Amino acid sequence: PVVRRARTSDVPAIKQLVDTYAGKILLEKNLVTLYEAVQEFWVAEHPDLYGKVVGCGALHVLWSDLGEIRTVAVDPAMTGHGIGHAIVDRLLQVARDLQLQRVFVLTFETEFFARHGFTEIEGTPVTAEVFDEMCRSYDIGVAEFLDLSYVKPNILGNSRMLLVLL
Amino acid sequence: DCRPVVRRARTSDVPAIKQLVDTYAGKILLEKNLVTLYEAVQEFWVAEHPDLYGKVVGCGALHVLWSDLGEIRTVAVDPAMTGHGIGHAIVDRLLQVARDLQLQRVFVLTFETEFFARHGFTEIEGTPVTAEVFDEMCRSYDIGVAEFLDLSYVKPNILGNSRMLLVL
Numbered sequence: 074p075v076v077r078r079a080r081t082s083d084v085p086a087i088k089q090l091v092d093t094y095a096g097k098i099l100l101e102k103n104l105v106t107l108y109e110a111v112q113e114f115w116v117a118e119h120p121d122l123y124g125k126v127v128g129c130g131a132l133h134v135l136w137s138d139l140g141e142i143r144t145v146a147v148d149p150a151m152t153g154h155g156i157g158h159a160i161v162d163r164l165l166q167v168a169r170d171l172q173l174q175r176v177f178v179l180t181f182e183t184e185f186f187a188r189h190g191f192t193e194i195e196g197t198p199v200t201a202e203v204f205d206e207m208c209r210s211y212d213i214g215v216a217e218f219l220d221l222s223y224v225k226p227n228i229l230g231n232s233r234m235l236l237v238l239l
Numbered sequence: 240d241c242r243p244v245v246r247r248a249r250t251s252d253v254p255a256i257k258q259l260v261d262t263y264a265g266k267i268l269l270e271k272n273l274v275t276l277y278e279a280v281q282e283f284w285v286a287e288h289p290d291l292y293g294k295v296v297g298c299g300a301l302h303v304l305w306s307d308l309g310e311i312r313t314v315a316v317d318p319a320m321t322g323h324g325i326g327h328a329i330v331d332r333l334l335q336v337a338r339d340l341q342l343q344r345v346f347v348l349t350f351e352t353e354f355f356a357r358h359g360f361t362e363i364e365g366t367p368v369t370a371e372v373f374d375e376m377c378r379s380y381d382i383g384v385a386e387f388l389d390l391s392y393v394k395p396n397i398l399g400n401s402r403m404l405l406v407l
């Protein structure tokens with residue numbers, strides 16, 4: 074499937090994908106914060122219909138060398154057609170374009186991301202000096218990566234996976 | 240005089256960007272710590288130094304605020320390189336990406352009224368969004384959005400600044 078960069082017109086559709094997977098699975102993102110993050114988002118168009126989008130995804134930078142894959146959602150009726158994998162394949166390519174070395178994921182979909190080289194891990198792989206700089210973030214997804222105390226109850230059960238690049 | 244290359248930022252550029260933002264502190268620019276610069280690297284732009292290959296002498300960023308609305312934020316140039324056309328080369332680029340995003344209006348909160356005027360910006364009053372959108376935008380964790388909404392707790396941090404806007 075075609076994986077293209079998101080457009081402000083795509084936000085209402087993107088919002089519906091995130092809301093579909095609610096807050097237990099995906100981290101909720103309100104309408105404004107999606108319009109602000111539109112420049113790092115990607116969407117998969119339906120293989121036949123030109124306009125409609127069936128999947129979204131975003132690469133979030135966390136530091137000099139570290140990136141994250143977040144807010145990956147596919148229409149419940151379109152899963153198992155390779156869409157989600159087509160999104161990750163491109164998201165990882167832009168991670169390369171960004172000269173990143175490690176890509177993080179916090180998810181229940183261990184099997185899904187495993188097919189891209191992701192291995193499950195424990196802890197936060199950053200220096201305490203770097204850890205201290207990231208505590209200063211206003212972004213919740215960063216806090217879930219740092220396993221900060223005030224987001225812990227929202228992410229128990231999720232697995233921490235990581236990918237290294239050539 | 241030379242028009243400098245204005246390219247997308249790279250994670251290696253963030254430390255340099257951090258010194259430019261820090262240079263203009265909180266009196267002029269809204270301060271941005273190191274992590275939020277690495278997170279925003281995909282919307283940031285930098286002007287390369289006409290002489291040093293790696294180092295950057297100016298930065299700038301376009302932040303989308305809604306379907307049609309964008310903002311230009313954290314635009315800074317080295318004090319020793321000011322008045323050499325860099326900042327306008329950055330703004331010219333930021334506005335081009337606003338078009339590629341199919342935006343219609345671009346907002347600015349600044350003291351540099353004449354600077355942005357050279358691009359067609361006109362001064363305004365208030366927050367130009369529907370009250371329905373205003374309510375959706377109140378939910379943001381970004382301080383720059385709160386300053387666009389003229390929220391009460393940031394008022395003392397922006398007193399004196401002018402609100403300008405550009406239409407495409």
Ligand SMILES: CC(=O)SCCNC(=O)CCNC(=O)[C@H](O)C(C)(C)COP(=O)(O)OP(=O)(O)OC[C@H]1O[C@@H](n2cnc3c(N)ncnc32)[C@H](O)[C@@H]1OP(=O)(O)O
Pocket residue numbers: 240263267268297311312313314315316320321322323324325326327328347348349350351353354355357
């Ligand atoms: C974040 C926001 O949204 S607010 C943005 C404002 N930020 C700030 O003011 C931070 C403090 N100020 C600054 O950092 C700087 O003033 C900047 C980065 C905004 C602009 O700096 P520079 O680009 O280097 O100055 P620049 O070379 O573009 O020209 C400044 C003036 O001199 C003129 N100009 C003078 N000489 C030249 C020249 N050789 N070439 C091109 N333009 C020139 C410009 O036309 C311009 O006139 P204008 O203000 O009426 O448009």
Ligand SMILES: NC(=[NH2+])NCCC[C@H](N)C(=O)O
Pocket residue numbers: 096097098099100101142143144145178179180214217227228231
């Ligand atoms: N708040 C949560 N339920 N978080 C679980 C992990 C969310 C995941 N990191 C994402 O991309 O959305």
Ligand SMILES: NC(=[NH2+])NCCC[C@H](N)C(=O)O
Pocket residue numbers: 264265266267268269270311312313314347348349383386396397400
């Ligand atoms: N210190 C402030 N918040 N000043 C108000 C203007 C902020 C400026 N537009 C910026 O992007 O940084």
